[PDB]
CSV table of C-alpha atoms and ligand atoms in Angstrom, one decimal:
chain,number,residue,atom,x,y,z
Q,1,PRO,CA,10.8,-27.9,-3.3
Q,2,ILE,CA,8.8,-29.0,0.0
Q,3,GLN,CA,8.6,-26.4,2.4
Q,4,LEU,CA,6.9,-26.9,6.6
Q,5,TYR,CA,6.1,-23.7,8.8
Q,6,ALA,CA,5.2,-24.6,12.0
Q,7,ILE,CA,2.9,-22.1,13.2
Q,8,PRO,CA,2.1,-20.6,16.5
Q,9,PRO,CA,-1.4,-20.5,18.4
Q,10,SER,CA,-2.8,-16.5,18.5
Q,11,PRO,CA,-2.6,-14.6,21.4
Q,12,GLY,CA,-6.0,-14.8,21.9
Q,13,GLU,CA,-6.2,-18.7,21.8
Q,14,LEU,CA,-3.1,-18.9,24.3
Q,15,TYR,CA,-4.1,-15.9,26.8
Q,16,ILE,CA,-8.1,-15.7,26.8
Q,17,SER,CA,-9.1,-19.0,25.8
Q,18,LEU,CA,-6.9,-21.1,27.3
Q,19,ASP,CA,-8.0,-23.9,24.0
Q,20,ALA,CA,-4.6,-22.3,21.9
Q,21,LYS,CA,-3.1,-25.4,19.2
Q,22,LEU,CA,0.2,-25.1,17.2
Q,23,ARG,CA,-0.8,-25.8,13.4
Q,24,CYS,CA,2.0,-27.1,11.6
Q,25,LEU,CA,2.1,-27.1,7.2
Q,26,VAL,CA,3.4,-28.7,4.8
Q,27,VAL,CA,3.3,-27.1,1.0
Q,28,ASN,CA,3.9,-28.8,-2.7
Q,29,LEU,CA,4.1,-32.2,-1.7
Q,30,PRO,CA,4.2,-35.0,-4.9
Q,31,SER,CA,1.8,-36.7,-3.1
Q,32,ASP,CA,0.7,-38.6,0.3
Q,33,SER,CA,3.6,-41.0,-0.6
Q,34,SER,CA,4.9,-42.3,2.5
Q,35,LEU,CA,4.0,-39.0,4.6
Q,36,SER,CA,4.0,-38.5,7.9
Q,37,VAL,CA,3.8,-35.5,10.0
Q,38,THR,CA,4.6,-36.4,13.8
Q,39,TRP,CA,4.8,-33.6,16.3
Q,40,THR,CA,7.3,-34.0,19.4
Q,41,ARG,CA,7.3,-32.3,23.2
Q,42,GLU,CA,10.8,-31.0,24.5
Q,43,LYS,CA,9.2,-31.9,28.0
Q,44,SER,CA,7.9,-35.6,29.6
Q,45,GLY,CA,4.4,-35.9,28.7
Q,46,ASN,CA,2.7,-36.3,25.5
Q,47,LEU,CA,0.4,-34.9,22.7
Q,48,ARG,CA,-2.6,-35.8,20.9
Q,49,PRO,CA,-2.5,-34.0,17.7
Q,50,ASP,CA,-6.2,-33.5,15.7
Q,51,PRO,CA,-6.4,-35.7,12.6
Q,52,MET,CA,-4.8,-34.5,9.6
Q,53,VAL,CA,-6.3,-33.3,7.1
Q,54,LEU,CA,-4.9,-33.5,3.0
Q,55,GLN,CA,-5.7,-30.9,0.7
Q,56,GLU,CA,-5.7,-30.8,-2.9
Q,57,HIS,CA,-4.4,-27.6,-5.2
Q,58,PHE,CA,-5.0,-26.2,-8.7
Q,59,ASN,CA,-1.0,-26.2,-9.1
Q,60,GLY,CA,-0.5,-29.4,-8.9
Q,61,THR,CA,0.6,-29.5,-5.3
Q,62,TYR,CA,-0.1,-31.4,-2.2
Q,63,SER,CA,-0.4,-29.6,1.4
Q,64,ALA,CA,-0.8,-31.0,4.7
Q,65,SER,CA,-2.0,-29.6,7.8
Q,66,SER,CA,-2.0,-31.5,11.7
Q,67,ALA,CA,-3.3,-29.2,14.6
Q,68,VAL,CA,-2.1,-29.8,18.4
Q,69,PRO,CA,-3.5,-28.5,21.1
Q,70,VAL,CA,-0.9,-27.2,24.1
Q,71,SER,CA,-2.1,-25.6,27.5
Q,72,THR,CA,-1.0,-22.4,27.7
Q,73,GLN,CA,1.3,-23.3,31.1
Q,74,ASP,CA,3.1,-25.9,28.9
Q,75,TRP,CA,3.8,-22.7,26.3
Q,76,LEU,CA,4.3,-20.2,29.3
Q,77,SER,CA,6.9,-22.3,30.9
Q,78,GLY,CA,9.2,-22.1,28.0
Q,79,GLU,CA,8.9,-25.7,26.9
Q,80,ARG,CA,9.9,-26.3,22.8
Q,81,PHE,CA,7.5,-28.6,20.3
Q,82,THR,CA,9.0,-29.5,16.9
Q,83,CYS,CA,7.0,-30.4,14.1
Q,84,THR,CA,8.6,-33.4,11.3
Q,85,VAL,CA,7.9,-33.8,8.3
Q,86,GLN,CA,9.4,-37.2,5.9
Q,87,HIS,CA,7.8,-38.3,2.5
Q,88,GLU,CA,9.0,-40.7,0.1
Q,89,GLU,CA,10.9,-37.3,-1.5
Q,90,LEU,CA,12.5,-36.6,1.6
Q,91,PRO,CA,15.8,-38.1,1.7
Q,92,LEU,CA,16.1,-36.4,5.4
Q,93,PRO,CA,12.6,-35.5,7.5
Q,94,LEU,CA,12.2,-32.1,8.1
Q,95,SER,CA,11.6,-30.2,11.4
Q,96,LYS,CA,10.9,-26.9,12.2
Q,97,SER,CA,9.8,-25.5,16.2
Q,98,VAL,CA,7.8,-23.6,17.5
Q,99,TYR,CA,7.7,-21.2,21.6
Q,100,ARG,CA,7.1,-18.7,23.5
Q,101,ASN,CA,9.6,-15.8,22.4
Q,102,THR,CA,12.5,-15.8,24.3
Q,103,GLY,CA,14.0,-12.5,23.2
Q,104,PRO,CA,13.8,-9.1,24.2
Q,105,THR,CA,10.0,-8.8,25.4
Q,106,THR,CA,8.5,-5.1,25.9
Q,107,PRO,CA,4.5,-5.2,27.2
Q,108,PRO,CA,2.1,-2.4,24.1
Q,109,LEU,CA,1.3,1.3,25.2
Q,110,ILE,CA,-2.6,1.5,24.6
Q,111,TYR,CA,-3.9,4.4,23.2
Q,112,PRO,CA,-7.3,4.7,22.8
Q,113,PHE,CA,-9.1,7.8,20.9
Q,114,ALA,CA,-12.4,9.5,20.6
Q,115,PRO,CA,-14.0,9.9,17.2
Q,116,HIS,CA,-13.0,13.1,15.8
Q,117,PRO,CA,-15.4,16.0,16.3
Q,118,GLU,CA,-15.9,16.5,12.8
Q,119,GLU,CA,-17.8,12.5,13.0
Q,120,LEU,CA,-20.0,13.5,15.3
Q,121,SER,CA,-22.3,14.4,12.8
Q,122,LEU,CA,-22.3,11.8,10.7
Q,123,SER,CA,-24.5,8.7,11.8
Q,124,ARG,CA,-21.7,6.8,13.0
Q,125,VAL,CA,-18.2,7.7,14.2
Q,126,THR,CA,-15.1,5.5,14.2
Q,127,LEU,CA,-13.5,4.1,17.5
Q,128,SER,CA,-9.9,3.3,17.5
Q,129,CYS,CA,-6.7,2.6,19.0
Q,130,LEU,CA,-2.9,2.3,18.9
Q,131,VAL,CA,-0.9,-0.1,20.7
Q,132,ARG,CA,2.6,0.6,20.5
Q,133,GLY,CA,6.2,-0.1,21.4
Q,134,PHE,CA,5.9,-3.8,22.0
Q,135,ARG,CA,8.1,-6.7,21.3
Q,136,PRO,CA,7.2,-9.6,19.9
Q,137,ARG,CA,5.0,-8.6,17.4
Q,138,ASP,CA,2.1,-11.3,18.5
Q,139,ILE,CA,-0.2,-9.6,19.3
Q,140,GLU,CA,-4.4,-9.1,19.3
Q,141,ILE,CA,-6.9,-6.5,19.6
Q,142,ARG,CA,-10.0,-7.2,20.3
Q,143,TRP,CA,-13.9,-5.1,21.7
Q,144,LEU,CA,-16.2,-4.8,24.4
Q,145,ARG,CA,-19.4,-2.8,23.6
Q,146,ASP,CA,-21.0,-2.6,27.2
Q,147,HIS,CA,-19.1,-5.5,28.7
Q,148,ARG,CA,-19.8,-8.2,25.4
Q,149,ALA,CA,-17.4,-8.9,22.8
Q,150,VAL,CA,-18.0,-7.8,20.1
Q,151,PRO,CA,-17.6,-9.8,16.2
Q,152,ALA,CA,-14.9,-9.4,14.7
Q,153,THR,CA,-16.9,-8.9,11.4
Q,154,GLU,CA,-17.6,-5.3,13.3
Q,155,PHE,CA,-13.7,-4.0,13.9
Q,156,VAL,CA,-10.8,-4.1,11.8
Q,157,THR,CA,-7.1,-4.0,12.5
Q,158,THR,CA,-4.0,-3.3,11.3
Q,159,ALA,CA,-1.7,-6.0,10.1
Q,160,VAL,CA,1.9,-6.0,12.9
Q,161,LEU,CA,4.3,-3.8,11.8
Q,162,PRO,CA,7.5,-2.2,13.2
Q,163,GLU,CA,8.0,1.2,13.7
Q,164,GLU,CA,9.7,4.0,12.8
Q,165,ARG,CA,13.0,3.9,13.6
Q,166,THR,CA,12.7,7.1,15.7
Q,167,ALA,CA,9.9,6.0,17.3
Q,168,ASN,CA,12.0,4.7,20.6
Q,169,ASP,CA,16.7,-4.3,21.7
Q,170,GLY,CA,15.6,-3.9,18.2
Q,171,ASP,CA,12.3,-3.1,16.5
Q,172,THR,CA,9.0,-2.4,18.8
Q,173,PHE,CA,6.3,-2.8,16.8
Q,174,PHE,CA,2.9,-1.2,16.2
Q,175,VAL,CA,-1.1,-2.2,15.0
Q,176,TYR,CA,-4.4,-0.2,15.3
Q,177,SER,CA,-7.5,-0.5,15.5
Q,178,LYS,CA,-10.8,0.9,14.5
Q,179,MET,CA,-14.4,0.4,15.2
Q,180,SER,CA,-17.7,2.1,13.8
Q,181,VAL,CA,-20.5,3.0,16.1
Q,182,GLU,CA,-23.8,4.1,16.4
Q,183,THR,CA,-23.3,7.7,17.0
Q,184,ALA,CA,-26.6,7.8,19.2
Q,185,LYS,CA,-24.7,4.8,20.7
Q,186,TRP,CA,-21.4,7.0,22.0
Q,187,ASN,CA,-23.7,9.5,22.4
Q,188,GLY,CA,-25.8,8.0,24.9
Q,189,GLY,CA,-23.0,7.2,27.2
Q,190,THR,CA,-22.4,3.6,25.8
Q,191,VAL,CA,-18.9,2.7,27.5
Q,192,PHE,CA,-17.1,0.7,24.9
Q,193,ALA,CA,-12.8,-0.5,25.1
Q,194,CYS,CA,-10.3,-1.5,23.2
Q,195,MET,CA,-8.0,-4.8,24.5
Q,196,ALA,CA,-4.4,-6.0,23.6
Q,197,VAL,CA,-3.5,-9.1,24.7
Q,198,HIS,CA,0.3,-9.7,24.4
Q,199,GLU,CA,2.8,-11.6,26.2
Q,200,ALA,CA,4.4,-8.8,27.9
Q,201,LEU,CA,0.9,-7.7,30.1
Q,202,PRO,CA,1.3,-8.4,33.4
Q,203,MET,CA,-1.9,-10.7,32.9
Q,204,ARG,CA,-1.6,-11.0,29.3
Q,205,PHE,CA,-4.4,-8.6,28.4
Q,206,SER,CA,-5.4,-4.8,28.9
Q,207,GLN,CA,-8.2,-3.1,28.5
Q,208,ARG,CA,-8.3,1.1,28.2
Q,209,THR,CA,-12.3,2.3,27.4
Q,210,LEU,CA,-13.9,4.6,25.8
Q,211,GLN,CA,-17.2,6.8,26.3
Q,212,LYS,CA,-18.1,10.6,25.5
Q,213,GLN,CA,-16.8,12.7,27.6
Q,214,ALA,CA,-19.8,15.2,29.0
O,1,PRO,CA,12.1,-21.0,-7.6
O,2,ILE,CA,12.6,-17.8,-10.1
O,3,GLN,CA,9.2,-16.1,-9.6
O,4,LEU,CA,8.3,-12.4,-11.3
O,5,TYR,CA,6.2,-9.4,-9.9
O,6,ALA,CA,4.4,-6.0,-12.0
O,7,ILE,CA,4.7,-3.4,-10.1
O,8,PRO,CA,2.0,-0.4,-10.3
O,9,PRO,CA,2.8,3.7,-10.1
O,10,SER,CA,2.5,4.9,-7.4
O,11,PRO,CA,0.3,7.9,-6.9
O,12,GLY,CA,2.3,10.3,-5.9
O,13,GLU,CA,4.0,9.7,-8.8
O,14,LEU,CA,1.5,10.0,-11.4
O,15,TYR,CA,-0.3,13.1,-9.7
O,16,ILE,CA,2.8,15.2,-8.3
O,17,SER,CA,5.6,14.1,-9.7
O,18,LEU,CA,4.2,13.5,-12.7
O,19,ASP,CA,7.2,10.6,-13.5
O,20,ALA,CA,5.1,7.3,-13.2
O,21,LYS,CA,6.7,3.9,-13.7
O,22,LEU,CA,6.1,0.4,-14.2
O,23,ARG,CA,8.2,-1.6,-12.7
O,24,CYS,CA,9.2,-6.0,-12.7
O,25,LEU,CA,11.2,-7.3,-10.1
O,26,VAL,CA,12.3,-10.4,-10.7
O,27,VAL,CA,14.1,-12.9,-8.1
O,28,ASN,CA,15.8,-16.1,-7.3
O,29,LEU,CA,17.7,-15.9,-10.6
O,30,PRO,CA,20.8,-18.3,-10.3
O,31,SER,CA,22.5,-16.0,-13.4
O,32,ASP,CA,22.0,-13.1,-15.8
O,33,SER,CA,22.5,-16.3,-18.4
O,34,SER,CA,20.5,-15.0,-22.0
O,35,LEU,CA,18.1,-12.9,-19.0
O,36,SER,CA,16.3,-10.7,-20.5
O,37,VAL,CA,12.7,-8.7,-19.7
O,38,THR,CA,10.4,-6.9,-22.0
O,39,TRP,CA,7.7,-4.9,-22.4
O,40,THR,CA,4.2,-4.3,-24.1
O,41,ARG,CA,1.0,-2.1,-24.5
O,42,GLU,CA,-2.3,-2.2,-25.6
O,43,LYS,CA,-2.3,0.1,-27.7
O,44,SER,CA,-0.4,1.1,-30.5
O,45,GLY,CA,2.7,2.7,-29.4
O,46,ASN,CA,6.3,2.3,-28.5
O,47,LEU,CA,7.1,1.6,-24.7
O,48,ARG,CA,10.7,2.3,-24.0
O,49,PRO,CA,11.9,0.4,-20.7
O,50,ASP,CA,14.9,2.0,-18.2
O,51,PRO,CA,17.9,0.2,-18.7
O,52,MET,CA,17.8,-2.9,-17.0
O,53,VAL,CA,19.1,-3.3,-13.1
O,54,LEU,CA,20.8,-6.3,-11.6
O,55,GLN,CA,21.9,-7.2,-7.6
O,56,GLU,CA,23.3,-9.9,-6.4
O,57,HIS,CA,22.5,-10.8,-2.5
O,58,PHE,CA,23.9,-12.4,0.0
O,59,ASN,CA,21.8,-15.5,-0.4
O,60,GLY,CA,23.4,-16.6,-3.2
O,61,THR,CA,20.9,-15.7,-6.2
O,62,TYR,CA,20.2,-12.5,-7.8
O,63,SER,CA,18.1,-10.2,-9.1
O,64,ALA,CA,16.9,-8.0,-11.8
O,65,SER,CA,14.0,-5.0,-12.1
O,66,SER,CA,13.1,-2.8,-15.2
O,67,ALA,CA,11.2,0.2,-15.2
O,68,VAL,CA,9.4,1.9,-17.5
O,69,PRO,CA,8.3,5.4,-17.8
O,70,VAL,CA,4.1,5.7,-18.0
O,71,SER,CA,2.4,8.6,-18.8
O,72,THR,CA,-1.4,9.8,-16.5
O,73,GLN,CA,-3.7,10.0,-18.5
O,74,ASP,CA,-1.8,6.5,-20.6
O,75,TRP,CA,-2.4,4.4,-17.1
O,76,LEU,CA,-5.5,6.1,-16.0
O,77,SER,CA,-7.1,4.9,-18.9
O,78,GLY,CA,-7.5,1.9,-17.8
O,79,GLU,CA,-5.1,-0.1,-20.6
O,80,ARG,CA,-3.3,-2.7,-19.8
O,81,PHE,CA,1.1,-3.3,-19.9
O,82,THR,CA,2.9,-6.4,-20.1
O,83,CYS,CA,6.5,-7.1,-19.0
O,84,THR,CA,7.8,-10.7,-20.1
O,85,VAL,CA,11.0,-12.7,-18.1
O,86,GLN,CA,12.9,-14.5,-20.6
O,87,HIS,CA,15.7,-17.0,-19.1
O,88,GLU,CA,17.5,-20.4,-19.7
O,89,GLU,CA,16.3,-21.5,-16.9
O,90,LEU,CA,12.3,-20.4,-17.6
O,91,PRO,CA,11.0,-23.8,-20.7
O,92,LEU,CA,8.8,-21.1,-21.2
O,93,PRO,CA,8.2,-16.4,-21.3
O,94,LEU,CA,7.1,-15.7,-18.1
O,95,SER,CA,4.5,-12.8,-17.3
O,96,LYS,CA,2.1,-10.5,-15.5
O,97,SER,CA,0.4,-7.8,-16.3
O,98,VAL,CA,-0.2,-4.6,-13.8
O,99,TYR,CA,-3.0,-2.0,-15.0
O,100,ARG,CA,-4.9,1.0,-13.5
O,101,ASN,CA,-8.3,-0.4,-11.7
O,102,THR,CA,-11.2,1.2,-13.2
O,103,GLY,CA,-14.6,1.0,-10.6
O,104,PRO,CA,-16.3,3.4,-9.0
O,105,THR,CA,-14.2,6.5,-7.1
O,106,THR,CA,-14.0,8.1,-3.5
O,107,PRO,CA,-12.5,10.0,-2.1
O,108,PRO,CA,-11.0,10.1,1.4
O,109,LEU,CA,-12.2,11.3,4.8
O,110,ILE,CA,-8.7,12.4,6.5
O,111,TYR,CA,-8.7,12.3,10.6
O,112,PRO,CA,-6.2,13.4,12.6
O,113,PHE,CA,-4.9,12.4,15.9
O,114,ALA,CA,-3.3,14.4,18.2
O,115,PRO,CA,-0.7,12.4,20.8
O,116,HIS,CA,-2.8,11.0,23.9
O,117,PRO,CA,-2.7,12.8,26.8
O,118,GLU,CA,-0.7,10.6,28.4
O,119,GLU,CA,1.8,10.2,25.4
O,120,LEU,CA,3.2,14.3,27.0
O,121,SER,CA,4.9,12.6,29.6
O,122,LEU,CA,6.9,10.6,27.8
O,123,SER,CA,10.2,12.6,25.6
O,124,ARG,CA,8.2,11.5,22.1
O,125,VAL,CA,4.8,11.6,20.9
O,126,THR,CA,2.9,10.2,18.2
O,127,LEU,CA,0.8,11.7,15.8
O,128,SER,CA,-1.0,9.8,13.4
O,129,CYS,CA,-3.5,10.3,10.8
O,130,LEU,CA,-6.7,8.1,9.8
O,131,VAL,CA,-7.5,8.3,5.9
O,132,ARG,CA,-10.8,6.5,5.1
O,133,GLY,CA,-13.3,5.7,3.0
O,134,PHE,CA,-12.0,5.5,-0.8
O,135,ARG,CA,-12.2,3.6,-3.5
O,136,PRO,CA,-9.5,2.4,-5.5
O,137,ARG,CA,-7.3,1.2,-2.6
O,138,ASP,CA,-4.7,2.6,-4.0
O,139,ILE,CA,-3.2,5.7,-2.0
O,140,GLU,CA,-0.5,7.7,-0.7
O,141,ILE,CA,0.4,9.1,2.5
O,142,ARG,CA,3.1,11.7,3.4
O,143,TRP,CA,3.6,14.2,5.7
O,144,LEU,CA,5.2,18.0,5.7
O,145,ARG,CA,6.2,19.8,9.4
O,146,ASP,CA,6.9,23.5,9.2
O,147,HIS,CA,6.5,23.0,5.3
O,148,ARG,CA,8.8,21.2,5.6
O,149,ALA,CA,8.2,17.1,3.6
O,150,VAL,CA,9.6,14.2,5.8
O,151,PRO,CA,11.4,11.1,5.1
O,152,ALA,CA,9.3,8.0,4.3
O,153,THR,CA,12.2,6.8,7.0
O,154,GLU,CA,10.3,9.4,10.2
O,155,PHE,CA,6.7,7.7,10.3
O,156,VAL,CA,4.8,4.8,9.3
O,157,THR,CA,1.8,3.5,7.9
O,158,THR,CA,-0.1,0.8,7.6
O,159,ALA,CA,-0.6,-1.3,4.3
O,160,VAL,CA,-4.5,-1.1,2.9
O,161,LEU,CA,-7.2,-3.0,3.8
O,162,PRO,CA,-10.8,-3.0,3.5
O,163,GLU,CA,-13.2,-1.8,6.0
O,164,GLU,CA,-15.2,-3.2,8.2
O,165,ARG,CA,-18.9,-3.9,6.9
O,166,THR,CA,-20.1,-1.7,9.7
O,167,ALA,CA,-18.1,1.2,8.2
O,168,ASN,CA,-20.3,1.2,5.7
O,169,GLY,CA,-18.2,2.9,2.9
O,170,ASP,CA,-19.9,0.6,-4.2
O,171,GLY,CA,-18.0,-2.4,-3.6
O,172,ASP,CA,-16.0,-2.0,-0.3
O,173,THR,CA,-13.9,1.4,1.0
O,174,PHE,CA,-10.4,1.1,2.3
O,175,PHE,CA,-8.4,2.9,4.7
O,176,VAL,CA,-4.7,3.4,6.9
O,177,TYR,CA,-3.5,4.2,9.3
O,178,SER,CA,-0.5,6.5,9.6
O,179,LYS,CA,1.5,7.9,12.5
O,180,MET,CA,5.2,9.7,13.7
O,181,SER,CA,6.5,10.0,16.2
O,182,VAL,CA,8.5,13.3,17.2
O,183,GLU,CA,10.2,15.1,19.6
O,184,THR,CA,7.7,15.9,23.0
O,185,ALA,CA,9.9,19.4,22.3
O,186,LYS,CA,8.6,20.0,18.8
O,187,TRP,CA,5.3,19.2,19.8
O,188,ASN,CA,4.6,21.5,22.9
O,189,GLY,CA,7.1,24.4,20.9
O,190,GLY,CA,4.5,24.9,18.4
O,191,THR,CA,5.3,22.8,15.2
O,192,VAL,CA,3.3,22.6,12.6
O,193,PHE,CA,2.7,19.0,10.9
O,194,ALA,CA,0.2,18.2,8.2
O,195,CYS,CA,-0.7,14.6,7.0
O,196,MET,CA,-1.6,15.0,3.2
O,197,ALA,CA,-3.4,11.7,1.6
O,198,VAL,CA,-2.5,11.0,-2.4
O,199,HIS,CA,-5.0,9.4,-4.1
O,200,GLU,CA,-7.3,9.4,-7.4
O,201,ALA,CA,-10.5,10.4,-6.3
O,202,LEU,CA,-9.5,14.0,-5.0
O,203,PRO,CA,-10.1,17.1,-7.1
O,204,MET,CA,-6.7,18.0,-7.3
O,205,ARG,CA,-5.6,14.3,-6.6
O,206,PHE,CA,-4.7,15.6,-2.7
O,207,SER,CA,-5.5,16.9,0.5
O,208,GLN,CA,-4.0,17.7,3.9
O,209,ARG,CA,-5.5,18.6,7.4
O,210,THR,CA,-3.1,20.1,9.7
O,211,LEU,CA,-1.8,18.8,13.2
O,212,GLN,CA,-0.6,21.6,16.1
O,213,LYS,CA,-1.1,22.3,19.8
O,214,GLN,CA,-3.9,24.4,21.0
O,215,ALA,CA,-3.8,26.4,23.8
A,1,LIG,C1,-0.1,-23.7,-4.5
A,1,LIG,O1,-0.6,-23.8,-4.4
A,1,LIG,C2,-0.6,-23.1,-3.0
A,1,LIG,C3,-1.7,-22.5,-2.9
A,1,LIG,O2,-1.7,-22.1,-2.1
A,1,LIG,C4,0.9,-23.1,-2.7
A,1,LIG,O3,0.8,-23.5,-1.3
A,1,LIG,C5,0.7,-21.8,0.1
A,1,LIG,O4,2.1,-21.6,-0.2
A,1,LIG,C6,2.8,-20.8,0.7
A,1,LIG,C7,3.8,-20.4,1.0
A,1,LIG,O5,5.0,-20.7,-0.3
A,1,LIG,C8,1.8,-20.2,2.3
A,1,LIG,O6,2.1,-19.6,2.7
A,1,LIG,C9,2.5,-19.8,3.6
A,1,LIG,O7,1.5,-19.4,5.0
A,1,LIG,C10,1.9,-19.0,6.5
A,1,LIG,C11,0.7,-18.8,7.2
A,1,LIG,O8,-0.6,-19.7,6.9
A,1,LIG,C12,2.8,-18.8,7.4
A,1,LIG,O9,3.3,-18.9,8.4
A,1,LIG,C13,4.4,-19.1,6.4
A,1,LIG,O10,4.8,-17.4,6.6
A,1,LIG,C14,3.9,-19.1,4.9
A,1,LIG,O11,4.1,-17.5,3.7
A,1,LIG,C15,0.8,-20.7,1.7
A,1,LIG,O12,-0.2,-20.8,3.6
A,1,LIG,C16,-0.1,-22.0,0.6
A,1,LIG,N1,-1.6,-21.5,0.9
A,1,LIG,C17,-2.0,-23.0,1.7
A,1,LIG,C18,-3.1,-22.3,2.0
A,1,LIG,O13,-2.0,-23.9,1.4
A,1,LIG,C19,1.8,-23.1,-2.4
A,1,LIG,O14,3.1,-22.6,-2.3
A,1,LIG,C20,1.9,-23.3,-4.5
A,1,LIG,N2,3.4,-23.3,-4.9
A,1,LIG,C21,4.2,-23.8,-6.1
A,1,LIG,C22,5.4,-23.1,-5.8
A,1,LIG,O15,3.3,-22.9,-6.8
A,2,LIG,C1,17.9,-13.6,-1.5
A,2,LIG,O1,17.6,-12.6,-0.9
A,2,LIG,C2,16.5,-11.2,-2.0
A,2,LIG,C3,16.4,-10.2,-1.4
A,2,LIG,O2,16.7,-10.0,0.3
A,2,LIG,C4,14.8,-11.7,-1.8
A,2,LIG,O3,14.9,-11.1,-2.8
A,2,LIG,C5,12.9,-11.0,-2.8
A,2,LIG,O4,12.1,-11.9,-2.2
A,2,LIG,C6,10.9,-11.3,-1.9
A,2,LIG,C7,9.3,-12.4,-2.1
A,2,LIG,O5,10.4,-13.9,-1.9
A,2,LIG,C8,10.6,-10.0,-2.6
A,2,LIG,O6,9.0,-9.5,-2.1
A,2,LIG,C9,8.5,-8.9,-3.2
A,2,LIG,O7,8.8,-7.5,-2.6
A,2,LIG,C10,7.7,-7.2,-3.1
A,2,LIG,C11,7.9,-5.4,-3.1
A,2,LIG,O8,6.5,-4.6,-4.6
A,2,LIG,C12,6.1,-6.6,-3.3
A,2,LIG,O9,5.2,-6.6,-4.5
A,2,LIG,C13,6.2,-8.2,-4.0
A,2,LIG,O10,4.7,-8.8,-3.2
A,2,LIG,C14,7.3,-9.5,-3.3
A,2,LIG,O11,6.5,-9.3,-1.8
A,2,LIG,C15,11.3,-8.9,-2.6
A,2,LIG,O12,11.3,-7.6,-3.3
A,2,LIG,C16,12.8,-9.4,-3.5
A,2,LIG,N1,13.9,-8.6,-3.2
A,2,LIG,C17,14.8,-7.6,-2.5
A,2,LIG,C18,15.0,-6.3,-2.9
A,2,LIG,O13,14.3,-8.2,-0.9
A,2,LIG,C19,14.9,-13.6,-2.3
A,2,LIG,O14,13.5,-14.0,-1.9
A,2,LIG,C20,15.6,-14.3,-1.5
A,2,LIG,N2,15.5,-15.6,-2.2
A,2,LIG,C21,16.4,-17.1,-0.9
A,2,LIG,C22,15.3,-17.9,-1.9
A,2,LIG,O15,16.1,-17.2,-0.4
């Protein structure tokens, strides 16, 4: 029942910090008996994977994870990266590939919402952002407050879903993100921003500002 | 890998249509050979399961589902219900339990959003609803248009999540977001829409907010 997954980097690590890693996860290993996880890149050059990590599980199994740095330029070029697992119980090696989307691509539309008027009596108000119409589904949302990054613990973003069949090359997707802010700060004119990070955007990210209107 | 899932009744079934059912889903069945799905409860009383339903799939496997009517009162009571599956490939019976969360409750707050002004030049606009601040996490969202029900295929609601710690919210409060794309002409023409939340903590177990284009 050995399963192998090749996990793509997050849009944030690819397009904001440019320090992305590919990750390979192997599950349901009966042991590390002749276990090996190896990476291959399609083009000339080398890869330098991090040390592989073995975890024990309560269900009596083992999992192995291996991460490898990938440059954003290499990712964007369309290069394919392949992880392969060998094991005593594996008659044939298992491989999975990961690479930048080659299917249809469509940039996200970003719609910021100010607090509902009925929230303004409360000590905190909700700023939110609908991001929709995009392909592929991989997207990251970040927030800024007075031009500085907001910690992830201070907002929440919904898991990406296909849009309803009426909303519009296949499904498009959407996410919604919201951030509770102090009412005094909102009323004070602080500028906030919701940022989408997505491969189909001109510069790979775009932001829309929110600020109280006079 | 035969798997078993126990599925609670929805708030709509519990409070609106009053036809709640517990459901059991078995996946990856190689066959119906010696298949049996049985239910048990905690209090004295005979459960009356619906007949089992089987489906053959393209991936070669079979799935089975079993539904059992449950009264809203019995569900709200916190009684635990268990579905058990036996099959020739199972050395021992497989079981899962389902029951209501009986912790503290808090009613949702519903905030409807008209289309962003930038959407009005498109052929469709998005109506949406943020529903937040509630406990427990079980909730159902429905939409109406001119007092008529909108089919579930015409809108999407996000999977419920805990709110961020600053929200702030007992323990965690939860939120969902629901949106419905409508023809811009229907919005501009003055149709009255409504987003409705069904939740156990509301006085009448539901509440709604209307959305209509303003002058
Ligand atoms: C035994 O117990 C472990 C407990 O974790 C199970 O491993 C989990 O297996 C699932 C898939 O079967 C993994 O989900 C995967 O998540 C990645 C993203 O992280 C996603 O890309 C894949 O689609 C996949 O769904 C999960 O990560 C993994 N948990 C960990 C941390 O290793 C295992 O399945 C159990 N085996 C049995 C049958 O008892
Ligand atoms: C072969 O195809 C069938 C049908 O697509 C697959 O059956 C499905 O299996 C998944 C889980 O692996 C089920 O998802 C479950 O959905 C319930 C809905 O309440 C959810 O609560 C659970 O958390 C779970 O994720 C899915 O319902 C089930 N059947 C259907 C109708 O899709 C099956 O997995 C495939 N088998 C293999 C091994 O290829």
